[PDB]
Every structure is written in C-alpha cells, then in structure tokens.
Design an enzyme around this catalytic site. Sequence first.
Site, PDB file in Angstrom:
ATOM      1  N   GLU A 122      38.302  46.997  33.913  1.00 46.93           N
ATOM      2  CA  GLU A 122      37.646  45.906  34.638  1.00 46.93           C
ATOM      3  C   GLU A 122      36.166  46.201  34.895  1.00 46.93           C
ATOM      4  O   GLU A 122      35.718  46.348  36.035  1.00 46.93           O
ATOM      5  CB  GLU A 122      38.379  45.614  35.950  1.00 46.93           C
ATOM      6  CG  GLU A 122      39.885  45.674  35.835  1.00 46.93           C
ATOM      7  CD  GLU A 122      40.575  45.282  37.116  1.00 46.93           C
ATOM      8  OE1 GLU A 122      39.989  45.480  38.201  1.00 46.93           O
ATOM      9  OE2 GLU A 122      41.704  44.767  37.036  1.00 46.93           O
ATOM     10  N   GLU A 214      49.840  44.400  31.888  1.00 48.87           N
ATOM     11  CA  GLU A 214      50.269  44.249  33.280  1.00 48.87           C
ATOM     12  C   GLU A 214      50.861  42.865  33.516  1.00 48.87           C
ATOM     13  O   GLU A 214      50.565  42.206  34.518  1.00 48.87           O
ATOM     14  CB  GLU A 214      49.103  44.501  34.239  1.00 48.87           C
ATOM     15  CG  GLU A 214      48.182  45.643  33.825  1.00 48.87           C
ATOM     16  CD  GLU A 214      47.062  45.876  34.805  1.00 48.87           C
ATOM     17  OE1 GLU A 214      47.005  45.149  35.816  1.00 48.87           O
ATOM     18  OE2 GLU A 214      46.240  46.785  34.559  1.00 48.87           O
TER      19      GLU A 214
HETATM   20  O1  LIG Z   1      45.844  48.798  38.402  1.00 45.34           O
HETATM   21  C1  LIG Z   1      45.317  47.496  38.767  1.00 45.34           C
HETATM   22  C2  LIG Z   1      46.364  46.770  39.547  1.00 45.34           C
HETATM   23  O2  LIG Z   1      46.369  47.301  40.881  1.00 45.34           O
HETATM   24  C3  LIG Z   1      46.180  45.251  39.644  1.00 45.34           C
HETATM   25  O3  LIG Z   1      47.397  44.704  39.891  1.00 45.34           O
HETATM   26  O4  LIG Z   1      45.643  44.595  38.407  1.00 45.34           O
HETATM   27  C4  LIG Z   1      44.527  45.349  37.811  1.00 45.34           C
HETATM   28  C5  LIG Z   1      44.940  46.791  37.510  1.00 45.34           C
HETATM   29  O5  LIG Z   1      43.861  47.475  36.873  1.00 45.34           O
END
Ligand SMILES: O[C@@H]1[C@@H](O)[C@H](O)OC[C@H]1O
Length: 305
Positions: A122, A214
């Site tokens: 990010e 994610e």
């Molecule tokens: O680890 C981070 C996480 O905490 C968040 O949920 O989304 C971005 C990720 O980089």
Amino acid sequence: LKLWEVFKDDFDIGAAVNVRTVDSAAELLRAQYNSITAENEMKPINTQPSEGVFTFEQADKIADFAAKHGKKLRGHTLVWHNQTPDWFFEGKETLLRRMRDHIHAVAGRYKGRTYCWDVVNEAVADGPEFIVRAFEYAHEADPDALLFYNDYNECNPAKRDKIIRLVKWLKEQGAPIHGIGMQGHYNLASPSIAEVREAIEKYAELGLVIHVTELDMSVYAWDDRRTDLLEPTAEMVERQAELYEQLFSLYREYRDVIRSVTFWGAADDYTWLSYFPVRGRRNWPLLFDAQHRPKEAFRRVVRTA
Ligand SMILES: O[C@@H]1[C@@H](O)[C@H](O)OC[C@H]1O
C-alpha cells in the site's frame, strides 16, 4: 469436498490466520485451504519492535503450522506505510540501511517456508526509490521467493492506473518485482464484476503473476455503519453467493495468470471487518460460517469448477 482440491489446478486457496485462529480453525485450515498467510505476525512492528531486537515467536507459530500440514506460506509484509515503527524514522541512507537489515532478517528467517513476499504494501495514496530498493533487498535476501506489490481498491480506475504506473516504473528501473497482489477487499455494492475483469486484464499486461491476497466480501457498503445486525439477511447471503460465483468463474478464466487466491480469514467467526471501520460490529464475508460449515457461497463457488 475441499476447496483447495476443487481449484488445485487453477490456483491456491489460501486463508489469513493469526496466533488465535491458527488453533481455533485448525481443522478447517487443514481440510479446505492449501495456503496460509500471517495476518499481523510478520508485519514490521510485530517482527522488530526496536532496532536489533527481533520477535519471531508469533510468526514462527503460524509458519510451523504451515510446514507441519504441508500448506504453502505467503509472506506479509516486509514494508508498509501505516505500520512502520517510530524508531525507524529516528537520514535517507540510514532508512535504506534499516530497511535492508529488516528485510534480510525477516525474509531470511522464513526462507525455505515463505515462497513469496508482499515486499511493499500500500504505497499508493488513496520517495519512489525506496520501493525499488525494497525489492532489491528482498531478492538479495531470498533469490527464490516471488516478490509482490500489494494494494487495495485495485479495481478503482483511478487507483488502478496509479498502481499500473508504479509497477511499470519499477520494472523500468530493474526492480525484481514478479507479481502484483490484488487485495480483494470487496463488498456487495462495489466493485462490479466488469470492474474486476477490467483490472485483471490491465494487470496481466505487465507480464507478472497475479495473487488475490486478502479476499473478502463485506455485506455492508463502506458507507453502511449500522450495528444492529447479528446475522446476515437472506438477500445478503444470496447476493454474496452470486458475486463469489462470478468472481471465481472470472478467476478461472484467468487461470494462466492467477496463481493463488487467499481469503483474509478462514471463517466468519473472525474477520478484521468486525473491527474496521466500525469497531464491535459483525460481518460475514467468507465462505464458511462461524461454525466452520460451508455457506451458500461455498456451494456456488465449487459449482463454478
Ligand atoms: O495487512 C493489512 C490488513 O490489516 C488489512 O485488512 O488490509 C490491508 C493489509 O495490508
């Protein structure tokens, strides 16, 4: 039936775990996922609290779980703007030196187990030379790992174009970047399927591996901040199952470029969305419910394959 086996020739099926869920979801992780990512335990503040002091206990536990049960292990993450220790900033060359030292210690500790790394996490706002050197130090510490840039809102056309510009510039400076990480923090209202397809096509044109790193499907749009729901509505479950089915059908279309799809969680009994943006709220964004039983999204997703 097991999720990973259904898509084993398409891409990995991964789950984010922490020191708690690696135990509470042990049976679910052993059966349904073939890839594991440490949710917070391999982050900078959790690995080097002060200069020269490294705390690997919690990340060792997650890595040992993956090695014990033959799970692949994603590394997350080496460099991150939001969670960089305060001591790091206490000259630009000293910053480079501390970045090289941290990368070598963390990527070296789990070399042979972490097959990839979110090297920079990010960097695009919702200077740039630091990102090139981070990839260089990472490839120096582990020449066998695949090096990723990881970011969210990757399907928003404005942020997507910035990400593409960043990666191409990194490639034009000789940075050993091998893949891009699509965080996949989606919801029912946004993004659309076409917006994800348009993003996957523009990301594949760079000749890099694609990891969905994610993935989750929030039931609330980012604006919605109500706290009066203890369970999702029927239409919430139905629309989530429909979007997941179209997402995994789209991922299978790009079989040749997508190599791993990781959910940011194992089951609905723990999700980071339960504390962000609204603390104390409940969300149900995964394929298994709070009892580690398959949801309607699971049934629809496996039918795509
Ligand atoms: O680890 C981070 C996480 O905490 C968040 O949920 O989304 C971005 C990720 O980089």
